[PDB]
Design a protein around this ligand. Structure first.
Ligand code: SF4
Ligand code: ZN
Length: 414
DNA sequence: ATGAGACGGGGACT
DNA sequence: TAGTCCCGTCTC
């Protein structure tokens, strides 16, 4: 309902004015140097400016700034314009994305650029609503980031950083993933975003959550919005010797509930921590088959995953899925290897060790093998088989799991 | 037809 | 050391 207590609202316009001014003044003296800020500040063309912002905001989804920087630079140097990206192949996109994770982001970014160039004359949509509707991979966050940063639209955003900042600043301790709490956070973000500098405000709020209002041990003594933070105000009471008026059980007859407030956590009582369920275990066997090749050998066999599901369309060493009880077997692996190599001397199969790779939702254990051939396969290389030099593999569209497998193969090789 | 699960990898910190 | 948290979009 609209009957939330003023304890969780900014009912005083003076507080809103001060929140914006304090945050932006801190940003103007503390802001990190980032390549997408540099490209954006100097690109007067709106479409080129939005493209540079769009790429960075897709790469930043569930990925830390420190990781993105090098990928962003590589991407913008290879595809400086929408037009360049639209002509790229998905295979080239996966090559550049290799190691960044959540690979559908890269595919959708290319699909979007192709749509913009080939259906919209190269012109990016100019509001959060139309960016979200028309561009694949662009949800509510990315659309608001592009619109505010690139087009000066007055629209607030809630990423993980802003969620944490707002839950402390207004002492929201309920499950933040619920529809009700999420709606309240977006409403706060829309109230607070500076109408004159909405992009800088959004960037400032996110960088505050990244560098000051951090998940653990936040730097409250260094915070520009300290005086306006409910979380901070409460910690400074402690053994008190301002609170939420409507936080009383409607029932005055039941046992009176007690506060789950943990004094030893301070402002980190907010937000509530998401309870995490461990990933399911899966098992696979994989083999680096090698042949001597010519100059720059040996060559290793790579094959392409299905274009759906996990790590879709990426390349990998031939692999088979195994049930736990049969995770050390060779039968199915050798059958898969012979698909791509013809008849194989199965005596050469060398067990190297195991590689455990953690996805967000799967703990995958590979039994890793190698099979070194004395010469090329007897038959011509089948369609879908790629024989790569070590350097080509390192630059190919492969998952990090397969790079760990390759590093195990390189170590055990003599 | 909505909401939990699918979907990668690593940085920071204990 | 080994463990933990957490940096959005889409669907099946
Ligand atoms: S005072 Fe502390 S808890 Fe509040 S916003 Fe600043 S860093 Fe976060
Ligand atoms: Zn309350």
């Amino acid at each position: 309902q609209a009957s939330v207590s003023p304890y969780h609202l900014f009912s005083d316009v003076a507080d809103v004015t001060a929140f914006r001014s304090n945050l932006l003044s801190w940003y103007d003296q503390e802001k990190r140097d980032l390549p997408w800020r540099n490209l954006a500040k100097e690109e007067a063309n709106s479409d080129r400016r939005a493209y540079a912002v769009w790429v960075s905001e897709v790469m930043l989804q569930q990925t830390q700034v420190a990781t993105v920087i090098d990928y962003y630079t590589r991407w913008m140097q290879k595809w400086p314009k929408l037009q360049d990206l639209a002509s790229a192949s998905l295979e080239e996109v996966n090559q550049l994305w290799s190691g960044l994770g959540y690979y559908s982001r890269g595919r959708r970014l290319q699909e979007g650029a192709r749509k913009v160039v080939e259906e919209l004359g190269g012109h990016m949509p100019r509001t959060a609503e139309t960016l979200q509707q028309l561009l694949p991979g662009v949800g509510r966050y990315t659309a608001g980031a592009i619109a505010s940063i690139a087009f000066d639209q007055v629209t607030g955003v809630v990423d993980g950083n802003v969620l944490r900042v707002l839950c402390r600043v207004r002492a929201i301790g309920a499950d933040p993933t619920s529809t009700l709490v999420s709606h309240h956070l977006w409403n706060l973000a829309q109230q607070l975003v500076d109408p004159a500098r909405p992009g800088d405000f959004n960037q400032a709020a996110m960088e505050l959550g990244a560098t000051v209002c951090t998940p653990q041990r936040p730097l409250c003594s260094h915070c520009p919005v300290q005086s306006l933070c409910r979380a901070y105000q409460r910690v400074q009471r402690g053994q008190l010797s301002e609170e939420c008026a409507l936080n009383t059980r409607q029932c005055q007859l039941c046992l009176t509930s007690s506060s789950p407030w943990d004094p030893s956590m301070g402002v980190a009582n907010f937000p509530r921590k998401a309870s995490r369920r461990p990933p399911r275990e899966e098992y696979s066997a994989t083999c680096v088959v090698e042949q001597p090749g010519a100059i720059g050998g040996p060559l290793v066999l790579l094959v392409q995953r299905p274009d759906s599901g996990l790590l879709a369309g990426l390349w990998e060493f031939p692999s088979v899925t195994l049930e736990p009880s049969e995770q050390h077997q060779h039968k199915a692996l050798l059958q898969e290897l012979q698909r791509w190599c013809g008849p194989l001397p199965a005596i050469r199969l060398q067990h190297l060790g195991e590689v455990i790779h953690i996805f967000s939702h799967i703990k995958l254990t590979y039994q890793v093998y190698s099979l070194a051939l004395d010469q090329a396969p007897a038959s011509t290389a089948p369609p879908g088989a790629r024989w790569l030099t070590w350097e080509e593999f390192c630059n190919a569209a492969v998952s990090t799991a397969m790079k760990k497998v390759f590093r195990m193969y390189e170590d055990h090789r003599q």
